[PDB]
Design a protein around this ligand. Structure first.
Ligand SMILES: *[C@@H]1O[C@H](CO[C@@H]2O[C@@H](C)[C@@H](O)[C@@H](O)[C@@H]2O)[C@@H](O[C@@H]2O[C@H](CO)[C@@H](O[C@@H]3O[C@H](CO)[C@@H](O)[C@H](O)[C@@H]3O)[C@H](O)[C@H]2NC(C)=O)[C@H](O)[C@H]1NC(C)=O
Ligand SMILES: *[C@@H]1O[C@H](CO[C@@H]2O[C@@H](C)[C@@H](O)[C@@H](O)[C@@H]2O)[C@@H](O[C@@H]2O[C@H](CO)[C@@H](O[C@@H]3O[C@H](CO)[C@@H](O)[C@H](O)[C@@H]3O)[C@H](O)[C@H]2NC(C)=O)[C@H](O)[C@H]1NC(C)=O
Ligand SMILES: *[C@@H]1O[C@H](CO)[C@@H](O)[C@H](O)[C@H]1NC(C)=O
Lengths: 162, 108
């Protein structure tokens, strides 16, 4: 990469209809407390209601943006209802090129770091002056930060213990 | 709508789906709120579903058109079933392929 810069695109405090501080697990511990991935937010229902999210973001920067989001595949309908209220849910993401509509996927799964739920992450490059439009009524792991990139060339990943 | 390849060579058939902007546009264009396209060949087993998101305008349009293809062998039939959002074929293409090359990029 020729330039890389972490920037805030959806501030954590701008989620006034949902709960952004309960999206936490002991699979991602930090200082003896439970925590999570710092650059995305695990949104959870507020007073037994997950109102449909509609959140747009316009790339008012001069270079490309790497944006990351995710979905939560829960364990059962009982866990779905507990976390997001709405039984049947979706995440749509829309760019000038992207046309995506994710659906949570209930199966029953072996525990990995205590968890049988799964987190599935997705990315895209957001061109200068394009906008990305999220719509979700549940299970949405929303971005807080994204990354500015300019790419002038390529290499590979090296594996080394040095 | 079924079609039988009564020709002697393979057929390249193309169809598509319309991913609209909102439920309000879905209803306006195709009435039925929840829709699908199924396509069936001796090999093909496909069931498409329109995909509502909200999208940046490209040539004025926020809707998207997603196209699909297949080769239809001689004496096979292709069976379409759709209650909405279907971009149906009118023409298809006869092909015989005896070899391969690539696409060249040239301004000449
Ligand atoms: C992403 O945002 C850019 C810039 O948006 C502009 O600044 C923001 C801070 C907000 O104040 C926006 O409301 C504001 O539009 C969008 O590009 C801009 O689009 C507007 C029209 O929507 C352009 O204005 C036009 O100006 C010409 C003359 O210059 C007039 O003829 C038109 O009638 C119209 O007023 C504006 O020039 C343009 N700016 C740039 C730098 O491109 C951008 O469209 C938006 N994302 C998407 C998906 O559209
Ligand atoms: C695609 O269509 C071909 C040809 O279809 C035939 O001609 C069309 C213009 C229509 O009139 C069709 O109704 C007509 O069948 C199908 O192949 C044909 O299948 C039929 C049986 O469905 C064959 O008839 C058989 O003939 C033998 C003896 O020759 C008898 O033992 C059988 O009882 C039966 O009558 C016919 O021979 C065959 N023709 C050719 C050239 O293959 C084809 O099946 C169809 N597509 C699919 C998916 O089946
Ligand atoms: C939660 O929602 C209920 C029913 O809609 C409402 O009566 C109550 O006031 C809400 N909670 C708080 C803390 O206001």
């Amino acid at each position: 990469i020729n330039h890389f810069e972490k920037i805030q695109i959806i501030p954590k405090s701008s989620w006034s209809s949902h709960e952004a501080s309960l999206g936490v697990s002991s699979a991602c511990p930090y200082q003896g407390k439970s925590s999570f991935f710092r650059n995305v937010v695990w949104l959870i229902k507020k007073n037994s209601t997950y109102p449909t999210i509609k959140r747009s973001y316009n790339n008012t920067n001069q270079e490309d943006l790497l944006v990351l989001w995710g979905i939560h595949h829960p364990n059962d309908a009982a866990e779905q209802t507990k976390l997001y209220q709405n039984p049947t849910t979706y995440i749509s993401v829309g760019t000038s090129t992207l046309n995506q509509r994710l659906v949570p996927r209930i199966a029953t799964r072996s525990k990995v770091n205590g968890q049988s739920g799964r987190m599935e992450f997705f990315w895209t490059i957001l061109k200068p002056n394009d906008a990305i439009n999220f719509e979700s009524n549940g299970n949405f792991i929303a971005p807080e930060y994204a990354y500015k990139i300019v790419k002038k060339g390529d290499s590979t990943i090296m594996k080394s213990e040095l």
